[PDB]
Amino acid sequence: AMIHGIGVDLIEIDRIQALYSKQPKLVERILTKNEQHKFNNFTHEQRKIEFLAGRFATKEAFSKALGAFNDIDCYNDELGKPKIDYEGFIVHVSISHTEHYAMSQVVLEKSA
Amino acid sequence: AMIHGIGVDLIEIDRIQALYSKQPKLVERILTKNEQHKFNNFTHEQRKIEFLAGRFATKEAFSKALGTGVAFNDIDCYNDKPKIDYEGFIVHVSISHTEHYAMSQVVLEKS
Amino acid sequence: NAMIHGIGVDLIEIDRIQALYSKQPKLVERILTKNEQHKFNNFTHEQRKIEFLAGRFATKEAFSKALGVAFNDIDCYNDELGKPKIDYEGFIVHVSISHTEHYAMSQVVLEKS
């Protein structure tokens, strides 16, 4: 098989919003220092929650593809395409948000 | 091609709960005996329904991935990580739940 | 040498599509190819008509993310086995769409050569 695993995750944005409101620490537990910069740079709070939600889903999806949040950095390339560097695999990612739900889709391809 | 097809399904858990509540034999129609062990062992009703909705989303995703044409209770999805066995392909699976929706995605790779 | 070029996913609210359609019917011609417009017009149940449209929009949006020109030039049809699909020289495009009463979604995976 050329694929190691696939992962997907759907989560409610109102739940991420709620947790972040009661616990600002959530951020440092889910995002990498890299992702923390991006989160802190948005001036629109709605957009921050979308970003957080999108990242949490990605890390859950990535994790399912395999079988630590802070150690899984999901960045955007020159095109603004989400990527994840993970030695031993070729990772493909894709995220989508709505007003209430965020979802990420991950597929891990064996590299060797 | 190396990939036969892909599939994804999104279902409202409440619709599963409604149907299951009125029609009990839905479990024997959608779940295989192997899956029934897991189902019958949950003591938390929302969990039973969540799991039922997920296997249904999976079975639907699998049928779309294969390309219609496969009975629900002949598609055993098991853990290890979710997976399925169907000769000819390497079936990859993933599931996700929220309070109201369950979704699954299937990728059928050619042997 | 990866087998896959990129994967894309899109989730969209049916009611938002219906709302835009109802104020700007022009959305059909802008989003669907003539082939798709005919199938769209074959339906009589508005709900199904809007699902279809929502599904295509999602598919093409996800296709763009997967690809990394124009929505009404991209024809999503059903293949021999009844699986949605798009043609694009250099790839085999695999598509899947799923609807609920309020959401339409689509996933796209592009193998290469």
Binding site: - | - | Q18, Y21, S22, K23, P25, T44, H45, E46, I50
Partner: protein, 76 residues
């Protein structure tokens, strides 16, 4: 008067999202088409735009069926 009927129907089908087969002249908005007062306000306003006519609530409240809406157009 077939013209005005189809124009009213068009508004009901593609702007209110109601199935075309349900739109008959004897159809009730609240009972058959699932359209409430807000929707009837939308219909009425859209009819003002398509005919350059003004329709006060006094005559908009008199429309409970498709034929009512149609009838009113034919009066202009």
């Amino acid at each position: 008067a077939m013209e005005n009927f189809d124009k009213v129907k068009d508004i009901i089908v593609d702007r209110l999202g109601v199935d075309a087969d349900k739109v008959t002249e004897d159809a009730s908005f609240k009972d058959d088409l699932g359209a409430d007062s807000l929707d009837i306000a939308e219909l009425v306003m859209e009819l003002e735009d398509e005919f350059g006519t003004e329709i006060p609530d006094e005559e908009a409240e008199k429309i409970n069926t498709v034929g009512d809406a149609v009838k009113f157009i034919n009066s202009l």
